[PDB]
Symmetry: C2
Subunit: 136 residues, 2 copies
């Protein structure tokens, strides 16, 4: 990994979304199934209306003792913390540290195109290459 290189080389497309009516319990299962620590919430027009992590689920559900059937809409954050595809790795890491986050949405020309997580960092630290061409 190179702290100078654009975040777009270490980011992933593996970004899952759920509808606002999706229950915390279902969102939790989906997260464990696909191994992701966060989820974006999309409205019926296909746009991001929210975002939330596993941590949000612990702090906004488990602690207050709220039902596991409540819609994630009730615990999601309604603004996103992002980084541009061209923002170099180092600066992205610094931003995640300052904001205390484990996941950061990637933006390009206004739209969310991917996400960078601590798992991705681990992947980069291990020098694992994503191949765009066929392997046999």
């Amino acid at each position: 990994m190179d702290m100078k290189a654009p975040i777009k080389v270490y980011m992933t497309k593996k970004l899952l979304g759920v509808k606002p009516s999706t229950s915390v319990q279902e969102a939790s299962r989906l997260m464990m199934e696909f191994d992701v620590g966060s989820l974006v919430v999309i409205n019926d027009d296909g746009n991001v209306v929210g975002f939330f992590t596993k941590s949000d689920i612990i702090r906004r559900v488990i602690v207050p003792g709220l039902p596991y059937d409540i819609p994630v809409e009730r615990i999601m954050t309604r603004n996103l913390i992002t980084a541009n595809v061209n923002t170099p790795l180092g600066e992205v890491l610094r931003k995640m540290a300052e904001h205390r986050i484990k996941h950061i949405l990637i933006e390009e020309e206004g739209k969310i195109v991917g996400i960078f997580t601590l798992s991705d960092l681990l992947e980069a630290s291990r020098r694992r290459l994503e191949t765009a061409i066929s392997a046999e």
Copy 2:
């Protein structure tokens, strides 16, 4: 950062434990208050007997339906995958990748003395100086 540097150089000693009887809900409140992602369960002797992360709470409480007030002892991991204080970063990252975990307890002579998470990895990634 140096792949051969002993993990103790990059870990955090800010590791807290709770007792087996502590409730999943209390533990969670404790985690938010202390700003930690996981906790270890400690017996009367003061030795670690378990470990669970925020992620584990979700996987064993939220999805199954269990009440948020049960004993963390029922949702804790007893199969501790650990690394040694002198285990080089490279080896830890391998072990972590192998076991697919984002938290690895650190031990000294068999006693838990800290933890290394991917958050610690991020900080190590940003360090500008190396440690002889």
